[PDB]
């Protein structure tokens, strides 16, 4: 039996690791692909725990569309969307 | 670092548990809720390892709209969309 919380925590961690690699590493073009996918799929943009790197990935064009404004980032958190997925929201 | 394959495997197992419990237990309302969220988010319907119960969720309207038909369920596998998510596709 898989725990909701643990698996959510693992997905979050996976996302954060990908988010970081996309900015701190021009090699990992796969990390950009992974980040762009989550952002499109979960309809979100970055993280609260990595608000500095999020503003960069926003201007790298990896977030979905509409905003592109740094003011909005605080309400586009992927950690929340990941929480909502495993909760049923 | 966190294992890309292991997390994908756990997310499937979580989904499979939600899919099963949504049908097997009549009023597992979060079970249904979780299943709907996955379907609507990942654009998919049931899994190929649970084709029997998948037809039962298809007809309970917990799958995405306009895709209702048992024939199509083979190409609407959520297991494949979970694979694509974590591999950036």
């Amino acid at each position, epitope marked *: 039996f898989v725990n909701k919380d643990q698996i959510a925590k693992d997905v979050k*961690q996976f996302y*954060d*690791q990908a988010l*970081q*690699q*996309a*900015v*701190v590493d*021009d090699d990992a073009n796969n990390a950009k692909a992974v980040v762009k996918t989550f952002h499109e799929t979960l309809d979100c943009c970055g993280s609260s725990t*990595l*608000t*500095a*790197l999020t*503003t*960069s990935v926003l*201007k*790298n064009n990896l977030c979905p569309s509409g905003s*592109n*404004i*740094i003011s909005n980032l605080f309400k586009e958190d992927c950690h929340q969307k990941i929480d909502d997925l495993f909760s049923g929201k | *670092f*966190v294992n890309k394959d292991q997390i994908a495997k756990d997310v499937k197992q979580f989904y499979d548990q939600a899919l099963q419990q949504a049908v097997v237990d009549d009023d597992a309302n979060n079970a249904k809720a979780v299943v709907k969220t996955f379907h609507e988010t990942l654009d998919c319907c049931g899994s190929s390892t649970l084709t029997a119960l998948t037809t039962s969720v298809l007809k309970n309207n917990l799958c995405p709209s306009g895709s209702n038909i048992i024939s199509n369920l083979f190409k609407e596998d959520c297991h494949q969309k979970i694979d694509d998510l974590f591999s950036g596709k």
Partner: single-chain antibody
Amino acid sequence: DIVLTQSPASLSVSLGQRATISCRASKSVSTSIYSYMHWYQQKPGQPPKLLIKYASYLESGVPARFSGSGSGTDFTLNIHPVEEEDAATYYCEHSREFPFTFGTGTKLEIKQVQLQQSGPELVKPGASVKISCKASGYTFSSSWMNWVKQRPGKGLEWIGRIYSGDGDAIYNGKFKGKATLTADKSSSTAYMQLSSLTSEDSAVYFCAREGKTGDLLLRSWGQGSALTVSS
């Protein structure tokens, strides 16, 4: 804000010889796969230079006799053997969260450039000044332009940063209200605006750039602009 505490404040080693500089953060500056603590070297009259990035990785060109170590809150810079060119002031800095902050500094003592800035300035108290920082068009529009202040004798202070593509700007709360960052693509020039000028706005103001993806590292600097406020 995160406070970075360096030690020792100054150091005199001979041409030998170990030099060990320490840097302590207020809270962790480390994720599961990175920190987020860096080391810059500044010699008199020049902009700082990135030596070690992300705790341990030497920037291209930096001698292997430089080494960086640490995790969480405690980080250490080691030079061995010390040579004449190491006579400088060493600042640690984090890029974990806004605002970016620097360490108090460690002066070591032995026993081509992009980003063109505006010239020196003497200006009355109460006035405004808009300091410029020009780059090549083509390089400009995707640039994350950072601004850093340095009062004579004192350390380094992060003002804010602006994305040149759309002029979207993040400010250090201490300068939010006083500093305005703007970017003009068709001048290839980034500007910093200072209002209600005071004797202690007198400093050298640097303009620094990041790498393509906006890796929060101050790669390219300018010469600085010497703003002095006086009657």
